[PDB]
Structures are given as C-alpha cells and as structure tokens.
Design a protein around this nucleic acid. Structure first.
Lengths: 172, 106, 190, 197, 136
RNA sequence: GAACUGGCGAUGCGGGAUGAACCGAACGUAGAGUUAAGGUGCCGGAAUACACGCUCAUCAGACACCACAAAAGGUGUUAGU
RNA sequence: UUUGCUCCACACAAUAUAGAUGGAUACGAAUAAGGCGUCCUUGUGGCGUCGCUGAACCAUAGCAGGCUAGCAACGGUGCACUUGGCGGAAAGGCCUUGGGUGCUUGCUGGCGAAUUGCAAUGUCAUUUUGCGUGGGGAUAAAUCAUUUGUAUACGACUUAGA
C-alpha cells in the first residue's frame, strides 16, 4: 500500500440532545486511499478516546498535497513500532522531496531493517528539519556537505539481446 | 537477388499448457525480432505456414504445408499464440515456421 | 553505512618513484624495487603533486573502508622498505643445549641450518626467501639478523625460523628454548 | 540468429550460463561452449570444493559403477549443470542435448570462428564487486581433473597465433578505414550521410 | 623519476551535470542535475527539452560528459538561463553520441524507396573504395 | 475422550513435488474470453520486471497445514534507546 | 559366387530430415578499466578519439534473375589451373603467386515477361543408399573342424598345422 498519499481526516462523536457540536478531532494519516485513511482514523480515535466508528462520524477527509513538492528536504520522523518481543520508539532521518515519499521510504526501511510490517508501525511525527546542525544521523549529514560530487563506479548496462558480441565494459 | 524471403522466421516453442497439462489446440510461437507484446500486436492475424518434407509425393510435390494464424500475444516477451487448421505435431517443438505478411494492414 | 567517499593519503619521499596502473603498484627507491598486486581490493589511486598519492573508496561499506586503510599501510610499507629497509633481530634462547645456526648450500639455494635444538639429532632447514639477507651479529651473543626490502618477506622468514624451533611433548612455559624475534626495525639507524 | 552460436565461457557464472544455454537448446538453437575451464561460480573456492566433495560421497551403496557419476572435467561439470535444466529423459530432451557441444579451451574449427558472450550470465556484470568467486579449472584440478596444464599450454599457443592474426587484421582495417575516409566528403558520401549512412 | 598514477576518471554526479533520460515519460531528453537526494536519487530539471522538474533514480538516467555551472537547488527559470548561457544543447549535438542517436533514428525513418537509393549509392561508393584499396 | 462448524468417507478438477481431509474450486458435451489458489532463471506456461534495504554461512537461506529446534552467547554486520 | 571389390565423374531411381531459406562476421587481457589512432628521451609514456550495444558490418537491383556495346581504371567477384607456405586440441582448414575464363547494378544504351487467371511452400536444400554408363586402382582373411595346455564348467583364452 506504498502508493502513499496524506489525508487530513476530521471527525467527531455523533451530536446528541445534551451535547450538540462535539469537539471535531483531526488527524493526519498516510494511506493508499480514502477508505484506509478513514479506517486508520477510527483506529487511532478508538485507541486514544472512547469513540468508535458506530458512535461517531467523519466530517471531512481531504488530501494534503506537499506545498513545495520539488525541493529537497530533510525529514525527521518519530515512530513507535512493535517488534517480536516488545514495543519501541524510534527516530529516523530521511532526505527526500516530499512527506509521502519520505513515509514510503520509512515503511520500506522499517520492513528491511526490523521486519516491521505496516500493521506494526505508528508514525508519531514527520517534520521538516529547518536547518543543518539539527540533522543527527551521518547517513543524512554526509549528503549535506559543500560541493558534493561522487562517481558511480562499475556501470552495468542492460542488454536487450541474449548474446553480445563485444565483451562489455563497466566504464562510466 | 540472393534473398527471396517474404516471411518472418518463427520458432514453434510448445503447446499452451499449465505445469502438468498441455493443450495441443494452441501453439506458442516465438517470432524472430519480436520482444514485447506491443511489437507482437503487429503480427496478430498473420498467416503461419509450417513447411515439412515427406518421401511420398502426394499431389505433385513431396513437401507439405500446415496452415494456421496468429491469434493473440503470449506473456511479456513477444511470444504469440497461434492456432493451426490441424494442430502441430509436437515433434516440431523447436522447428521453424513462417509468419507471412498477409493479411496486411500496412 | 556505505560512506559516500573515504580517502587515505600516501606520502612519497624524494628518492621514490611509484607507478600504479590498474592496481599493480611498483615502488622504486635507492636500494631497489618492490611490486605489489592489489587487484583484489577495488580501490582508486590518484596522484596529486608527485609527492602525494591519494587512495579512495567510493560508496564503500565498513569492511571495504577497513581494507582502504590496509591498502594505505601496504603501500607505506613498500615505500619504507625501498627507503630504509626492514631489519629483524632474533635471539637464541637455550638452557642447556647451544643452538647451532649456520648458512648452508644444499643445491643452488641458501638454507638456514639449525642443529642441536634440545640435543636433537634432527637438522632443521629453513629456506631463505629472495631479497632476504642473513647475518650473524657480532658483539652480541647468539643473535641472527634478517634484512631486506620487503617487510612481508623478512618477517615471514623470521616467523619460519621461529616456528621451526617449537618444542613438542614438553611444557613450553618451562622448556622455553627457541629462536625469538627480539627487534623489529629498519636497516638504517636514526 | 546464427546457425551455430559459439559462447566463450570465460567469466560467465555456471548456473546462469546453463539456464540460458538450456533454453536456447530447447528452442532449437545449436550452441558450442568453449573455454569451460575459465567459467566462474559464485562463492569461495573452499566452499565450492566442499560442495563437490558432498557430491562425491553420493553413490549407489551396493554397486558404485551404477551410482551417480562424478565427472571432473570443467566441460562435464557445466554439462551436468545443463542437465537438471533440461528434461533429459525424453526424446525432446535428448535432441536438445544433442544440439550442444562443450569444450575446454577453443579447439578447431571454433578457434577461427567468432565467440560471443551472454551478458546476463557474465560475472563482471552480475556479481557484486568484492564477492568471492571460484574458477572452474582450479576446482576441477582439485577434484581430480588431469589436463589443466596441457590445456593452458595449448591455449597459450592458440593465443599467440591469434595475436598474429589480430595484428594482421589491425593493419588491414586501418588501411580500409583510411581509404574509406579518403573517399568520404564525395557526392555519394554526402548523399549517404543525408540518408543516414 | 616521476611518479605516475593512471587516473581512471569517471563522469561525476554533481549539481549541473547533464543527464540523458533513457526510460520514462521523457525517454531521450537531456536534463540537468539540480540537487542530490541520496546515493541513488537526484533532482533533475529539463526546461529546454520540456522535462518536468522531478526527483528521479540514477538508474533512470545516464550521465553525459557534459557539465555546466549551476548553483545547488536552482529553480527552473535559473536552470533555463544557465542552460542557454552554457549552450548545452549545441555541445550535446556536437558529440558523436548524439549523432549516433540521430543516425539510428534517421535509419529507422527511412522508407523502402530510400533504402533502395542507399543500396545503389553504397554500391557506387564501394566501387570507388575498392579502387582505392587496390591502389593501396 | 467430548463441544460447534466445515470437510473426507461418497469427489473428480487447478495448486501444496509427492499425500483422503489443507488452499482454490465442486464436475453434462464443446468453443471463446476472464480469473481463483499458486506461480513467472531452467526443468515449466508466465517479467534473469521495476523499487528500497538486509545477509556471505570452512553445517547459508529459500513459503501456511508440513515434514522440528531451545535455554544461552558473538567489537560479524545493520538500525535504534 | 549368376564376370567380384574399391575410388573419382556422370545421369536415374528410391531415402528421410529434432527442421537451410543472404553471411557462425576469429586478438588477448582488464572491468575501481579498456579499444583505436598518432608522437617520442620505448614506458605501468604523452596527446587525441570512441563506447552509453549487432538498431552494427559486409552483402543486397536484373525471366529464383533471360539477350548485349562501350567509357576512366586494371578494380570487384565466382569456376577450374597453378606457385609456394602455415595449421595435429578434433589438424581436414587458413593464407598467398601468376595466368585463363564467366559475370559485373560503377554509368549510359537495345529486347522479353502476361492466362499460376485475386492467395494456396507453389517445390530451388541437405542425407543415406541401390541399379546402370566410363576412367583409375588393388588381387585377402576369419570362423568351424583338427591340434596345445601358460587356459578352461560350457563358451572364452593360449598355441601349432600346406
């Protein structure tokens, strides 16, 4: 489900005769589609308040597009996840051009490094790092140096045919 | 001219099949120079001839023909499905067939 | 972590010429020539100013950048061996039987011959590697000197001589007899 | 597309080359593989030698002459890999296997024919740099192949003769290229360049 | 007496490096490297060729030997101005790589009649070339 | 040895190599199309697809039922508090 | 042994094809490097250029390809002859000297084709042979039976016999 979009989901408890106009709670949810986004909304509202989908209503769901989707950003993400033997809190840094793409990278990386499935991940917070010297992971820091430039040694060229006649090279 | 060919070379690969059951009514053909279904779309409906030789002369000739035609593409790599008037004899798995340019839409 | 770029710096003294094509390094100093094949390491050599050679690993992991420092040490040892050379000193340790060490000729090859080790009637022969010179130092009792341009070959000949004089079927921490490397330095004294 | 395709096995990974050749032969293409002793297997030499020893212990208990046979030559190791990728017990599999020849070195007449490569099976393109790999000739010698030295000597002889061929070929192609360039910028050359030639 | 080290130079991923996109929506248009995301990702912009400003994998492009001065993270108008100032398109078109692409496309665009002229013209040039080889 | 339900027995078919019971799906005789479960290096029909990472094992690992593995350890390497 | 055997030529008959339909088009080595060209105070040398696929190169027009005269030039390409070499990993192929002869679409010239009826592989290849024709060449053995015992259940083995 990593064709990720971000939605704002606003919902509430159902109005009653004694309590009209409830407090209109809102969440930011990364999900593949609106159905999953509303599911995640009710999942988190059930887990933090005494409101289930039966006693409430979704007032609004809107897709939030990245404000500047074409500038490279440094993102700090806070997650809590479940391992095989406990729950843990984690902080990670992702360099990428949008929030949804950072979160996609986050899910792929948590699956790769911790075998943490989507079920097992709560994204606590995704925030742009305003400036350098606040980045704390070296794998992001090393890309922020001055006049960065590196080669890509050992280029492997795709061959459309079964046999080549030339014993190819890896120069680049 | 040293060449007189007016057909495209093809190879009869196998029958349509699952892992353990084949269907001889459909033949899988690899057309030389075709690598994508998009390219193989050109050849749908083209007549196919399998040409083979016999000792006995039948009707003024010792070389016999099995006719068929390309029906649809198969997979992602340019293989096409073909149906023949009589099914190909399965000893021809790996034999050469001729895909003609008629009927022509170009 | 796959560091983007890691480099090490190699200093080249004035009398030394290093030629590196592909990964075949040759170093030519006043005392002679050394040649090393590094084709198994996958690094990049780049000369800066005829006295400085950079060596780099691009997008390399932990063990690959450990091997980069290893390459730096190997080339440094080549240069130090063609400038000063390597000298290894061995002392003879014995409690009762004096160890008799001689240079001998069997057939076209020099052999370090060891006799009377723990009173043994066996005669131990250690081949001398090419480039390694053998001397028996005077004014110090029972010291043999290994000298050469390659620290690898000198130290391996030293280790061969030390390993061939291991004690068997005895408590070695009591029967301490042997030929042990006592000094690891250069040929020129400074 | 050629009637016979001659594959230089040097630098290829044995299993990927076997899969490619098996599909070629099953689709009715004739393949000659030369320099089987220069094939490559991923993994360290000791690992692949342990694997071959584990192969070596498997034999029919009550009669070893009917058990699995343990061929030591590099060409027969590659042929063994090709079996298992061809259903050799059928008539169609026997025909596909009869479409195949494997050699150590490059014997005649293939020594004067062009050799091709299979880039999807090339180690230099497929293996990650820094990964250990095994050479089939040395593995075969270690498990009992007898003819590594004679093959190396005879391949050196073929390589010197081929180098003389190539020096002559360089002279001729330089002559042809210089004379073609001289005849360039003529009316026919201009028109052919306009047409894309 | 002089130390010699074979450099083994590469094309470099840096801001301002000209890339040729080889597959995707553009598929054969030049773009400029605007900023480096990570080891496999960059931001490119191709305003002259109409390539949208986008973040792309380095496996989707192939670096060219062309390079021009460009500040990090430059916007699309700035890239356009610097591209025009450096005359990147002409420097590309002067390369044998670009003429190879143009020449394969021209061959693909030939008609059957044009192929017939190609055959006759090649025979004539071959006749003259063979005379030159005989004299040589 | 009991409970509820679904099955096998009484049932072929596609998949799990193989198998009463699992997954999918239940069956007149055919044609065409699309799929299920399962797959797409080769055997073997179908991408040696694309993408992000992790792992090198001188007993690697490789799919549910299912054809086992533990307590306890490692400056191996990778993320993190 | 119905005047046997064998090898070149040759027309005939069969034959049966794991599958021809322009060309299998020759360095080696490396890939965190190379190819090619050029120059020199010959190197692990300088300089330039190339790759990013064979999407190439060669070939390729003519009744499945018929009939002909020249022009610059002595080219291109078959067929037999021939000169010398080279190749033993399974060489059985590669290169070259000279003349003869056919074609040449390099260019400009001259005639024909139809009715296979609107397509039908529309037969052009490659094997193995048997019967004839006309030239060349060669002119045995093995087994049974008998015999030996270095062998042996029988076969087999090992010996001998004009």
């Amino acid at each position: 489900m990593a064709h990720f979009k971000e939605y704002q989901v606003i919902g509430r408890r159902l109005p009653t005769e004694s309590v009209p106009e409830p407090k209109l709670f809102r969440m930011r949810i990364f999900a593949s589609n609106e159905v999953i986004a509303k599911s995640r909304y009710w999942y988190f509202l059930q887990k933090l308040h005494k409101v289930k989908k039966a006693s409430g209503e979704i007032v609004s769901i809107n897709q939030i597009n990245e404000a500047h989707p074409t500038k490279v950003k440094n993102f700090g993400v806070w997650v809590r996840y479940d391992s095989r033997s406990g729950t843990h809190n984690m902080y990670k840094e992702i360099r990428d051009v949008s929030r949804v793409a950072a979160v996609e990278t986050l899910y792929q990386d948590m699956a790769a490094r911790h075998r943490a499935r989507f079920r097992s991940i709560h994204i606590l917070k995704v925030a742009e790092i305003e400036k350098t010297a606040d980045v704390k992971r070296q794998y992001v820091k090393q890309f922020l140096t001055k006049d960065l430039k590196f080669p890509l040694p050992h280029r492997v060229q795709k061959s459309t045919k079964t046999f080549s006649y030339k014993r190819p090279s890896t120069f680049y | 001219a040293e060449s007189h060919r007016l057909y495209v070379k093809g190879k009869h690969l196998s029958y349509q099949r699952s892992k353990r059951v084949n269907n001889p009514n459909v033949s899988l053909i690899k057309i030389e120079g075709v690598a994508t279904p998009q390219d193989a779309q050109f050849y749908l409906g083209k007549r196919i001839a399998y040409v083979y030789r016999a000792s006995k002369e039948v009707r003024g000739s010792k070389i016999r023909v099995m006719w068929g035609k390309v029906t649809r593409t198969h997979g992602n790599s340019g293989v096409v499905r073909a149906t023949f008037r009589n099914n190909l004899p399965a000893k021809t798995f790996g034999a050469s067939v001729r895909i003609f340019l008629y009927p022509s839409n170009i | 972590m796959k560091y983007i770029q890691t480099e090490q710096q190699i200093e080249v003294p004035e009398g030394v010429t290093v030629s590196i094509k592909s990964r075949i390094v040759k170093v030519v100093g006043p005392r002679g020539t050394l040649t090393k094949n590094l084709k198994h390491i996958d690094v990049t050599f780049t000369k800066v100013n005829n006295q400085l050679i950079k060596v780099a690993v691009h997008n390399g992991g932990r063990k690959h950048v450990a091997a980069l420092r290893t390459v730096k040490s190997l080339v440094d040892n080549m240069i130090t061996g063609v400038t000063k050379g390597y000298k290894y000193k061995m002392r003879y340790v014995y409690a009762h039987f004096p160890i008799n060490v001689n240079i001998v000729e069997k057939d076209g090859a020099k052999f370090i011959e060891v006799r009377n080790f723990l009173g043994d009637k066996k005669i131990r022969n250690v081949p001398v590697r090419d480039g390694v010179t053998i001397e028996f130092s005077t004014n110090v009792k029972d010291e043999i000197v290994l000298s050469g341009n390659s620290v690898e070959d000198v130290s391996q000949n030293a280790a061969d001589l030390q390993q061939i004089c291991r004690v068997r079927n005895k408590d070695i921490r009591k029967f301490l007899d042997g030929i042990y490397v006592s000094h690891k330095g250069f040929i020129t004294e400074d | 597309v050629e009637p016979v395709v001659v594959i230089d096995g040097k630098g290829h990974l044995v299993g990927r080359l076997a899969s490619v050749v098996a599909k070629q032969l099953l689709n009715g293409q004739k393949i000659v593989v030369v320099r089987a002793e220069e094939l490559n297997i991923s993994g360290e030499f000791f690992r692949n030698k342990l694997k071959y020893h584990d192969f070596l212990r498997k034999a029919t208990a009550f009669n070893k002459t009917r058990g699995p046979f343990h061929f030591r030559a590099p060409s027969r190791i590659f042929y063994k890999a090709l079996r298992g990728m061809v259903s050799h017990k059928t008539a169609r599999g026997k025909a596909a296997l009869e479409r195949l020849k494997v050699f150590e070195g490059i014997p005649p007449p293939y020594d004067k024919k062009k050799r091709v490569v299979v880039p999807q099976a090339l180690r230099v393109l497929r293996l990650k740099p820094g990964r250990k790999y095994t050479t089939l000739g040395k593995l075969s010698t270690s498990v009992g192949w007898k003819y590594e030295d004679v093959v190396a000597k005879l391949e050196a002889k073929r390589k010197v003769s081929s180098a003389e061929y190539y020096a002559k070929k360089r002279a001729f192609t330089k002559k042809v290229a210089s004379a073609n360039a001289t005849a360039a910028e003529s009316d026919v050359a201009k028109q052919l360049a306009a047409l894309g030639y | 007496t002089d130390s010699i080290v074979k450099a083994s130079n590469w094309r470099l991923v840096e801001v301002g490096r000209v890339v040729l996109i080889k597959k995707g929506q553009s598929a054969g248009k030049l773009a400029a490297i605007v900023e480096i995301i990570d080891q496999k990702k960059v931001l490119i912009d191709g305003p002259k060729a109409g390539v949208p400003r986008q973040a792309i994998n380095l496996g989707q492009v192939v670096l060219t030997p062309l390079t021009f001065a460009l500040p990090r993270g430059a916007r699309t108008a700035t890239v356009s101005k610097k591209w025009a100032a450096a005359a990147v398109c002409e420097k590309w078109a002067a390369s044998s790589w670009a003429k190879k692409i143009a020449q394969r496309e021209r061959r693909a665009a030939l008609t059957d009649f044009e192929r017939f002229q190609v055959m006759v013209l090649r025979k004539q040039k071959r006749y003259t070339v063979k005379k030159a080889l005989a004299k040589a």
